[PDB]
Amino acid sequence: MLTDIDGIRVGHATDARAMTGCTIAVFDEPVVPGVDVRGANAATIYTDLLYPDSVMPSVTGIMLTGGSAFGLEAALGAVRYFEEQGRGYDVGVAKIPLVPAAVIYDLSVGDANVRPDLAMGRRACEAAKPGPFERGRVGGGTGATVGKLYGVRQSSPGGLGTATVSLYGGIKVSAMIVVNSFGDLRDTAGRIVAGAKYEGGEFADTYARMKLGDKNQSALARMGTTIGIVSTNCRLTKVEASRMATLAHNGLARAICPIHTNVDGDTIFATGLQKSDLTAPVDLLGTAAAEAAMLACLDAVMQ
Amino acid sequence: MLTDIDGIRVGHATDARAMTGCTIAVFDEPVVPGVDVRGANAATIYTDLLYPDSVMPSVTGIMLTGGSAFGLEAALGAVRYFEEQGRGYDVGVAKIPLVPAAVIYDLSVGDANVRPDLAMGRRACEAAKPGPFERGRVGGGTGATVGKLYGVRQSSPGGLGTATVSLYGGIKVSAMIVVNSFGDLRDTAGRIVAGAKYEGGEFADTYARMKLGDKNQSALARMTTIGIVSTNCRLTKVEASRMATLAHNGLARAICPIHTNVDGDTIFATGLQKSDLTAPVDLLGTAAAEAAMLACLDAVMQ
Numbered sequence: 001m002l003t004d005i006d007g008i009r010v011g012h013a014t015d016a017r018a019m020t021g022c023t024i025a026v027f028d029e030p031v032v033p034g035v036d037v038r039g040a041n042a043a044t045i046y047t048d049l050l051y052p053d054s055v056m057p058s059v060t061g062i063m064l065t066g067g068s069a070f071g072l073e074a075a076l077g078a079v080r081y082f083e084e085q086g087r088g089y090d091v092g093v094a095k096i097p098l099v100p101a102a103v104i105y106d107l108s109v110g111d112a113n114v115r116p117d118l119a120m121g122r123r124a125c126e127a128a129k130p131g132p133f134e135r136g137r138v139g140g141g142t143g144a145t146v147g148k149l150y151g152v153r154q155s156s157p158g159g160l161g162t163a164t165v166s167l168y169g170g171i172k173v174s175a176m177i178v179v180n181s182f183g184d185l186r187d188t189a190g191r192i193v194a195g196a197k198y199e200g201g202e203f204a205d206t207y208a209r210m211k212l213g214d215k216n217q218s219a220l221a222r223m224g225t226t227i228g229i230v231s232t233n234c235r236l237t238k239v240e241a242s243r244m245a246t247l248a249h250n251g252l253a254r255a256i257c258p259i260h261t262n263v264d265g266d267t268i269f270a271t272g273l274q275k276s277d278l279t280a281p282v283d284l285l286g287t288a289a290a291e292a293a294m295l296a297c298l299d300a301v302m303q
Numbered sequence: 304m305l306t307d308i309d310g311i312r313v314g315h316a317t318d319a320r321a322m323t324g325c326t327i328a329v330f331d332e333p334v335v336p337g338v339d340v341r342g343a344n345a346a347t348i349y350t351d352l353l354y355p356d357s358v359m360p361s362v363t364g365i366m367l368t369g370g371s372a373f374g375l376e377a378a379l380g381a382v383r384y385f386e387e388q389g390r391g392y393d394v395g396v397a398k399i400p401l402v403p404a405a406v407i408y409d410l411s412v413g414d415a416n417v418r419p420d421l422a423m424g425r426r427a428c429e430a431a432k433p434g435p436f437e438r439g440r441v442g443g444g445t446g447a448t449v450g451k452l453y454g455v456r457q458s459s460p461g462g463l464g465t466a467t468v469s470l471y472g473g474i475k476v477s478a479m480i481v482v483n484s485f486g487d488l489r490d491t492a493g494r495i496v497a498g499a500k501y502e503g504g505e506f507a508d509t510y511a512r513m514k515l516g517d518k519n520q521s522a523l524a525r526m527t528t529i530g531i532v533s534t535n536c537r538l539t540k541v542e543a544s545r546m547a548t549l550a551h552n553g554l555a556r557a558i559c560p561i562h563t564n565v566d567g568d569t570i571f572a573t574g575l576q577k578s579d580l581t582a583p584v585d586l587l588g589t590a591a592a593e594a595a596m597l598a599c600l601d602a603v604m605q
C-alpha cells in the first residue's frame with residue numbers, strides 16, 4: 001500500500017468500456033526523486049530532472065498511465081490542475097509543477113481511439129486520497145495484459161498492484177506497480193501464475209517456447225512493459241534515490257521472464273523524503289524495494 | 304538552413320504578444336535519431352527511444368518550444384495532428400507518431416500565462432514547409448533571452464538561428480538552434496555580442512562577474528540552448544548519439560558559461576536511414592559543432 005508512506009495520496013481514473021486509465025501518486029510532502037529506465041521501448045516525460053547530475057526538482061506527483069505515446073497527455077493535465085491549486089516551483093510570475101510519467105501499451109484491448117488525455121489526468125488528481133486504494137484492473141492497470149508471445153488474444157489479464165515491506169525502527173519501503181509485461185509472471189517457487197496461454201487455456205511457458213524458435217507476435221514486435229513507483233519514508237540523496245530505483249529492477253527479474261525485452265518500456269521511479277529522521281544504507285533499501293516491487297507484481301494479478 | 308537536408312520541413316507558430324511559440328522540424332524521409340541532454344535543468348519528452356540501447360523508433364518530427372514545463376503540451380498537439388494525417392508506426396489498430404521535444408523558459412517575458420498548447424502545437428505542423436524559413440525572434444525563439452545573471456531585465460534578446468556546413472562529396476551538416484542561454488554569446492574573435500548588461504551601460508561579462516562573487520539572480524536560480532543537428536549521411540543509432548555529443552562542443556565555443564544549473568541544454572541529432580553518403584562520425588560531429596556555433600550567432604543577427 002503506497003499510501004503507507006507519509007504524505008502520499010493515490011488517485012485512479014478508469015474507463016472500463018475503452019479499457020484504459022491512469023494512476024497518479026501525489027506527494028503532499030517534498031520528495032527526493034530517482035529513476036531507472038531499463039526497457040528498450042519506453043515513453044516517458046520529465047525524467048531528465050530525476051537523475052543525480054540534474055538539479056533538485058519540485059516533483060508534485062508521478063503518474064502511471066495507459067494509452068501508449070498518447071497517454072502522456074494525462075501528465076500535462078495533472079500539471080495544469082496542480083498549477084490551479086497553487087503547487088509547483090515558485091518562479092515569481094507563475095508556479096511550475098512537475099509530473100513525471102511513463103506509459104504502457106493498452107491499445108489492443110477495448111477501444112484503441114480512447115486514451116488518457118488532459119481531462120482524464122485531471123480526474124485522477126481530483127480523486128487522489130490517502131488510505132487504501134483499489135488494485136487490479138483499475139487506473140493505469142485497466143487495460144493491462146500479461147504474456148503476449150502469441151498476441152493479446154492468448155494473454156492473461158494484468159493490473160495494478162501494491163505492497164509494503166517493513167524494516168526496523170519504523171522504516172518502510174512500499175511499491176505500486178502496473179504489470180503489462182510481455183513475459184510471464186512467476187511466484188517464488190517458479191510456477192506460472194499469469195502469462196501466454198495456448199488456445200485451450202494452459203500456460204505455454206513463454207521463455208521455453210522462444211528457446212524452441214517461437215517468434216514474437218505482439219503488436220510492437222516489428223520495431224527493434226512494467227512500470228511502477230517505489231517509495232520509502234527514509235531521507236535520501238539524489239544518488240541514493242536513483243540507486244534505489246536501479247536495485248528495484250532486480251525484483252522485476254524475480255517475477256517476470258523474459259523482462260527488459262525490446263517491446264518492454266520497464267521504468268521504476270523512486271522517492272525518498274527530503275525532511276525525515278529515518279536513515280538506512282541504500283543497499284538494504286534497494287533490496288527492500290526489490291522485494292516490495294516483486295510482491296506488488298503478484299498483487300496486480302491476484303486482486 | 305536546416306531544410307538543406309533531404310525531406311526536412313520547418314514550421315513556426317509565433318505569439319508576438321505573449322512572447323512565446325514553438326518550432327517543429329518534420330521528417331518526410333526516415334531518420335536515425337540521437338540525443339544528448341547536457342544541461343542540469345532540462346524538460347523533455349520521448350527521449351528514451353533516442354538512445355543507442357533502445358529500439359529504432361519512427362520519429363515523425365522534433366519540436367523546440369517555449370513555455371517551460373507547460374510547453375511540452377504542444378508536442379502532443381503535434382502527435383494528434385500527425386495521427387490525423389496517417390503518420391506514425393502502424394500497430395494495425397492505430398498509428399503512433401512520435402514527436403520528441405525540449406523546452407526553454409520564456410515565462411518572464413510577455414504573458415506568463417500563455418504557453419504552447421495542443422492547438423499551437425498543431426498550428427506549427429500546419430505551417431511546416433520546405434525551403435527557407437524565418438529566423439530571429441520567431442517560433443520557439445520568440446521569447447528567448449540571453450544573459451540572465453542580473454535577471455531578464457538586464458538581458459539581451461535571443462532567438463532562433465540556423466546554419467549549414469558543406470563538406471566533400473555532397474555531404475551536408477545543418478543545425479537549427481534556439482538560444483535562450485544564461486551565459487553570454489561571443490563571436491569567433493571573442494567579442495561579446497549578446498549577454499547580461501550593467502544597470503546603465505555595457506556588457507558585464509557574466510563569467511568575470513561570477514568570478515568576482517556576483518550571485519545568480521535568474522528566476523530558476525533557487526534550484527537553456529536547445530537545437531537539432533542533421534546530416535544527409537547514413538548513420539547508425541550510436542553515430543547519431545555521438546554526433547549529438549560532439550555538437551555540444553560548438554555550444555561551448557559560443558556561449559559561456561554553458562550547461563549551468565539553470566540551463567536545459569539539449570541537442571537532437573538525425574541522420575538519413577536510406578542514403579549512400581557515409582563519413583566518419585567524429586568528422587561529422589566536428590562539423591556539427593561548427594554548424595551549431597554558427598547557428599547561435601545567426602539567431603542574434605536577425
Ligand code: NA
Pocket residue numbers: 018019020106107108109110111112143
Ligand atoms: Na484500451
Ligand code: NA
Pocket residue numbers: 103104105106180225263264265
Ligand atoms: Na507495453
Ligand code: NA
Pocket residue numbers: 321322323409410411412413414415446
Ligand atoms: Na512569454
Ligand code: NA
Pocket residue numbers: 406407408409483527565566567
Ligand atoms: Na531556460
